[PDB]
DNA sequence: ATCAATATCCACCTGCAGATACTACCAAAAGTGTATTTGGAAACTGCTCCATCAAAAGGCATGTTCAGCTGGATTCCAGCTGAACATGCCTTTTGATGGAGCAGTTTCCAAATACACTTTTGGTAGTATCTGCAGGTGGATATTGAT
DNA sequence: ATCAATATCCACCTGCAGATACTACCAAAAGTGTATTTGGAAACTGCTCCATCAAAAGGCATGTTCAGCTGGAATCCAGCTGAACATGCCTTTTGATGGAGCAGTTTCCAAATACACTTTTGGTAGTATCTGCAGGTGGATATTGAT
């Protein structure tokens, strides 16, 4: 019986498919064993993050699918996943409301 | 007698209608066709995926949101609140968009 | 056999309500007559800086489609990376 | 003929969503997002893990040169959790076998 | 009466003069120490190439002044001549150096 | 006298830096206000150069870790190799 | 003791062919480096995002040329790409 | 024997040029017309920018190109200001500016 | 208009930091030649999906009228920031001087690659069937604006 | 404050697009095992260049005064721009057809990698000669600002 290297590192994102890919990608000659785990639990934890804060956001707005609205949401509102993302424009996703405060009327 | 909204009140219900949704705000035929003019004049006898010209009008009015919101501070910071040329002007220099 | 008709100031089928509802979104409340035409120059030139790179994609590809791909890469390397339509 | 197959991470990312929030679904474009932004992260990671080792004139990219590349890469707090979720992923991996 | 200029004739005298020029402005020793104290908080007992705190005054001072050009063009669209932190402020905002 | 280091960037320096920006007149809150933008870009900048350093398993940070950092930051750098 | 490589005396050589009696500071010269090893860098890392693209494990002479073009302004790429063939050509039949 | 930039016409080294793409991870193979093509590019911009920093050095009377030079040469030029646009060069100054609303009168 | 006070420019000069021309030394690197491998261009073609078609209709663009209130011009003046001057404080120079530590060299093994074989899996593919929620209606609550 | 016109809300529901489910199939992917190669860590160490030291020298930062002039506040008003309405056009939607061309599979050789060997070159290190121009001087004269 044999372990997928994703079960012997505890993660569910696909350590071998990384590994590949790693290789595949011409940034080294070499790619050490522990390189893509690392990779995948990052890639895994981030993925982890986002869709916490959406799921969030889909509940807020009395949702159980998660779209690409509460993916924008998640991310706009969240500093760092703000910071991270700042160059990356998300698909049907709109923006955060926000009126400047001297447009409102007094 | 018959009703009128002040100025400015039905321009702050369209503010809070188009940030609430996501739905495209530009026609999508007529964008096609501004897409396969300008392509066309780059290479002729071109064709495009649908999905192509999706994902240009996704980011043009991404862009153009973007820009308008920056336009906006620009007119707020001459204490204005109608935004003008100079504005998307000075925002596009200080992005290096022209500098 | 048979071309389709002429292609020209398509740039005016983006229409001034169109433009409004853009600046809306971005929080704009009130909008100056000339605003509308500068917007379009602003667009076009966006427009062909993408498409430009996109159709070299293409060309580079030999082929006579532009893939959504080819759209995604040149967006990426203009700096307006879009999650949505690929790779 | 067959159409190749054409590889996605969206069976691990459904997986992670089931782990996170289990009575939430997710659609098909929203997922198309998910999976633009892993493979985004991950040339990000892999490109600057590359130039990393290329300056220390090392032909190797191994788990160090990762974690180097997460924290020049994260803000903050998403930074420390990933270097800590990496570290434990690695160390319970060698830690077989 | 004693010799006097006007108010901003000396002031575009010194604009003339180090637009001229490619010096660098702020003194190297404060500098040397503000560097020092920083990499301080990353890592301690570091110790610097010459070239290393050269390089980073180099880039350092052309950033403020890049920025100083944009916070120019702001306070000028509010109609002022003179700078404020209202000027920075803008001028990063829409770099996207913040908010 | 006790003196703080982001102080020792001085009021004539910062003016002298202005002036070069081609500015003109100087209100009396920019020199606080640009300080802090001065201390926020290097701490950016070294944080990055100092994780170079670490890696390469160092002791002093070299010009070209300045540099690979600056290209980081989008303020590539020419004249201190790379 | 190593050896340090530089463009330096290609930098040179060009520059007397374009401007015989022109010196150039050491400074100077250090950021004629940085140029050419950026540049370099851009139109290669363009050129390997390219062969990627098209599942290909070759960058040659046309990977090199589409990236000129993404990269350089209108002019100077028409330029570099006529200098680039012209170059080509010549070592074809030299 | 004779080198390939001699071979190319080329000043610029076609060898280096080739060995680096090779030990840079861009690819897995590289064709042999690659390197000429990309030396030729380097040498052209790099004439291009001496070229215009030489004229640069006569105009302020000196025969010595130094960084400053370089800049003036750089930034007065439409293309070459855009494709070194995010790029700072050492101890080069700023092109001489004033907005015309600080003149006096 | 005049006229005094500084700033600014041009011509010339000289010391020297930095450029240069030289000879010799050499490890690496580039060229050459031969054998071997293989990427990807050709050719052929299955089949996705792109361009084009029609036809019906209502969502939305266009154009106009009307006047609310915004932007721009004008004035005015308190006070903030520039200019100038008098101190004196600490940045700068540079030169010597330990010595930290970068970096070159040697050793050698934990870990990487190559490879052959076995097994597991994620990706269509074809149908088949739930189900979240878009969008419709209707009526109660809230907002805006006139008075 | 009252009230009336209209937007906004939210419960309720129904059709269905798209999500979920299942089986079947399998090519590529992933894992195992054995043998072979080697990247780079470890230890030692030489030499570069970094930190620190003294110690004037003075250039430049700091504190103060004074007032020119700018920023901001207030006032006015022409006319731009928003709100609403009538009209009807062209975008949207739905569905179908032909075929352009993208893409999948197979054959095949020009070109690339892989070695082994030879020859060339660029970086180097002292070593000495050379020179472009920074910086200083004087005196012409241009600019600024007072009358
Ligand atoms: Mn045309
Ligand atoms: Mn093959
Ligand atoms: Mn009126
Ligand atoms: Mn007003
Ligand atoms: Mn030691
Ligand atoms: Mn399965
Ligand atoms: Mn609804
Ligand atoms: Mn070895
Ligand atoms: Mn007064
Ligand atoms: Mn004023
Ligand atoms: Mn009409
Ligand atoms: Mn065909
Ligand atoms: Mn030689
Ligand atoms: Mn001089």
Redesign the interface.
């Known amino acids: 019986k044999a372990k997928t290297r994703s079960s012997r590192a505890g993660l569910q994102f696909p350590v071998g498919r990384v590994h590949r890919l790693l290789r595949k990608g011409n940034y080294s000659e070499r790619v050490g064993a522990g390189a893509p785990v690392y990779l995948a639990a990052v890639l895994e934890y981030l993925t982890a993050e986002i869709l916490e804060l959406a799921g969030n956001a889909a509940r807020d707005n009395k949702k159980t699918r998660i779209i690409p609205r509460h993916l924008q949401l998640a991310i706009r509102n969240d500093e760092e996943l703000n910071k991270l993302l700042g160059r990356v424009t998300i698909a049907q996703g709109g923006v955060l409301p926000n009126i400047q405060a001297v447009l409102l009327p007094k | 007698k018959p009703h009128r909204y002040r100025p400015?009140?039905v321009?702050?219900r369209?503010?809070?209608?188009?940030?609430?949704?996501?739905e495209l705000?530009?026609?999508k035929?007529?964008?096609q066709?501004?897409?396969?003019?300008?392509?066309?004049d780059?290479?002729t006898?071109?064709?495009?995926?649908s999905?192509?010209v999706?994902?240009?009008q996704?980011?043009?009015?991404?862009?153009?949101?973007?820009?308008?919101?920056?336009?906006?501070?620009?007119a707020?910071?001459?204490?204005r609140?109608?935004?003008?040329?100079?504005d998307?002007?000075?925002?596009?220099?200080?992005?290096?968009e022209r500098? | 056999k048979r071309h389709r008709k002429v292609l020209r100031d398509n740039i005016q089928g983006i229409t001034k309500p169109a433009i409004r509802r853009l600046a809306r979104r971005g929080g704009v409340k009130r909008i100056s007559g000339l605003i509308y035409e500068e917007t379009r120059g602003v667009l076009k030139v966006f427009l062909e800086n993408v498409i430009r790179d996109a159709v070299t994609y293409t060309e580079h590809a030999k082929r006579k489609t532009v893939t959504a791909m080819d759209v995604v890469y040149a967006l990426k390397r203009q700096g307006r990376t879009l999650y949505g339509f690929g790779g | 003929r067959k159409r190749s197959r054409k590889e996605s991470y969206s069976i691990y990312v459904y997986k992670v969503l089931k782990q996170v929030h289990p009575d939430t679904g997710i659609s098909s474009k929203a997922m198309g997002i998910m999976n633009s932004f892993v493979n985004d992260i991950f040339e990000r990671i892999a490109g600057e893990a590359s130039r990393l080792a290329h300056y220390n004139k090392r032909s190797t990219i191994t788990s160090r040169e990762i974690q180097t590349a997460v924290r020049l890469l994260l803000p903050g707090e998403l930074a420390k959790h990933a270097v800590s979720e990496g570290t434990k992923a690695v160390t319970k991996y060698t830690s077989a076998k």
């Open positions: 400015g009140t321009a702050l369209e503010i809070r209608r188009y940030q609430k949704s996501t705000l530009i026609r035929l007529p964008f066709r501004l897409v396969r003019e300008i392509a066309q780059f290479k006898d071109l064709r495009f995926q999905s192509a999706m994902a240009l996704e980011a043009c009015e991404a862009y153009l949101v973007g820009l308008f919101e920056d336009t906006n501070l620009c707020i910071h001459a204490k609140v109608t935004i003008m040329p100079k998307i002007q000075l925002a596009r220099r200080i992005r290096g500098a």
